[model samples]
Target: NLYQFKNMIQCTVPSRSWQDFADYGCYCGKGGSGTPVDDLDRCCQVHDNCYNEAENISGCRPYFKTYSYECTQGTLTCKGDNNACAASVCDCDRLAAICFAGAPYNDANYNIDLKARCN
Candidate 1:
């Protein structure tokens, strides 16, 4: 499933999920540049199934679009001092700063892990 985080949104399917965007670039309340190159770089660097999609380069655009919209929109306030209906959005920096010395790229299990930790 694709979900919206505090700073971004992404697909959570294990094999289909691309972690590079949240890893190298910005997503879910992290600081990073937004660009097509960022996504391509992450995919190429990982060299997993993501690399295969880069070959044709068409399929990858939609993924980037989805992430970009969700992530960008998430930053803007939808409701109160807190965000809207959801308890909280995925916050990678908090994980890196407090919980763990480092954070995983985009874990397929993020919902169970990060989702519950939100404000």
Candidate 2:
């Protein structure tokens, strides 16, 4: 789900596995029939009122890929915060590498917090 809470966007996905990273944001999922189904939770279709116009160059609503979620993947870029990772950068390269490595499967299954990273 993607919504504005406390002046920040928030997104999340329930864990199918006991332990695995989750992605969150508007239109975070890649496949579907343009509607919510039992198999998956559909991403937000509308933009939140909190979104600032100056942030976008094209007046486009930010999508899942536009933000980062986790900063604790034990990667070098995420160092200095107790080894925990946060979206220090605007683009989430580390999170994308892991999800893209598996191609289509990980693209849909993984969960990331777009608001946390983009903010």
Candidate 3:
């Protein structure tokens, strides 16, 4: 049974997995069906056995492939901290990635924080 959470407009399958690497690509939908939200806990379902279930879903596809994450502006780029893994450079020192408001608005207020590889 697929579970969806409230306020979680986006739902990336496989909440958390130790993925050493991920593809530099993304998929997007519109008012077609999925409504967009920002919070994970509010909009996504937590799987007790995500590992096993994820395998069955796509036969070894990346964890977040099958599942969709929330896209408010209709783009894959996310905002705020630990948000989407969009266009940004990872800082080895903080082990985090920084995201800006897609040019023109690139500044501190537009900065989004995300996890990254440690140096």
Candidate 4:
């Protein structure tokens, strides 16, 4: 699903799989050395949950639209023909940058498994 959009976001940030990444939710990609702690984790959780709410543009756009403001320095490029899809993906990355900008990185529930952490 959104994994396809990973490359667009620093070629990392594997959005989510719901059935996977059970414990490594707060990673930039884990493999890509993402943040798996505190505020960073919280941000990742929200993004993953948001992505889970969609498989199409309409479902993806509204939630993502709020992140219209760019956060990543170079992650502001969505030069695709699919204006609709581009906006959605850009919006996803957009919020992430914003979230990370203010990431306090707390570890209170840091390594908790996705079992109870997700809901």
Candidate 5:
């Protein structure tokens, strides 16, 4: 159903819904069980890590409450291409969000239970 690819939104622009949005782990964190249930889940974990580093290096906020995801839109400070933290975090968010949009849930990569590959 999501395969249709409706919007032509550029990943660089960062959607408001996606401005700071990222899955906690698969199905919006539901798939977060240490081992990604699928590649989609992997995206979530990576996104989480991205924000952590984004905050550490960029001094941006972390998920919600600290909400660096809202860096671009938050009233706390200005954002966009001009800001380091906003741009970097947005890249991570956009990559993960866009990746999630088309993640091949039906592909072999979707089903994940491999122990050796987990981090």
Candidate 6:
């Protein structure tokens, strides 16, 4: 399930030129830029899967769409806000990846805690 944070999410990028647009938080779903490549280059673990956060590439100016899947599920879906919630019954919502646009290429760097109560 995809969800939105009660508060704004935070994404971190290495102190590089791509930090510009990437710094902004991205929404979860099929529209957002999706997992950014910069995040993989800087901190994503080897086992972690990266994806775009928006429908179109950021900065590319030609593509702009909201993420459509559960950012935590590593899949794309539609857009939802505070009503979003994870379906896991672990009583915990895992931190999800953030995607955004930046320089040279797309940029992603952020993690957001779910505002919904864990199962």
- Judging by lDDT against the true structure, name the best candidate: 4
Off by over 4 Å in 2: 1-77, 81-87, 105-119
Model 1: lowest-lDDT 10 consecutive positions:
85-94
Best by TM-score: 5
Off by over 4 Å in 1: 1-11, 16-21, 26-29, 34-119
Candidate 1 TM-score over all chains jointly: 0.18
Q: Tell me, what's the RMSD of every candidate?
A: 16.2, 13.4, 17.2, 8.5, 9.4, 15.3
Task: Summing lDDT over every window of 10 consecutive residues in candidate 4, give the lowest-scoring window.
Answer: 62-71
User: Which candidate do you rate higher for lDDT, 4 or 5?
Assistant: 4
lDDT of the structure predicted as candidate 1: 0.28
Q: What is candidate 6's lDDT per residue for 50-114, written digit by digit as tens?
A: 22222122332112212232433333233343221212210111233233212233433333322
Give the lDDT of residue 68 in candidate 4.
29
TM-scores of the candidates in the order shown: 0.18, 0.20, 0.18, 0.44, 0.48, 0.18
Q: Against the unseen true structure, what C-alpha lDDT does each candidate score?
A: 0.28, 0.28, 0.21, 0.46, 0.45, 0.26
Error of 4 at 42 (Å): 3.3
Residue-wise lDDT of candidate 5 within 1-119, one digit each (tens)? 01111111133223434322223333333234456656766767787677668777645653421212322332122234336665565566556656666554433443344343443
On residues 1-119, what C-alpha lDDT tens digit does candidate 3 reach at each position?
11212112122222322121111111011111122122221111111123334345333432232233333443343234531221111111011111111112212211122222111
Model 6 lDDT-worst window of ten: 84-93
lDDT of 4: 0.46
The residue-by-residue lDDT of candidate 2 on 4-95, one tens digit each, is 11012111211233123133332334322233221222322221211322134343343321333333333323234421112322223333
**Candidate with better lDDT, 2 vs 6:** 2
User: Model 5 off-target regions past 4 Å?
Assistant: 1-27, 30-33, 64-80, 105-119
lDDT (C-alpha) at residue 90 in model 6 = 8
Which pairs clash in model 4? 28-34, 38-106, 39-106
TM-score pick, better of 1 and 4:
4
Q: Please report the TM-score between candidate 3 and the true structure.
A: 0.18
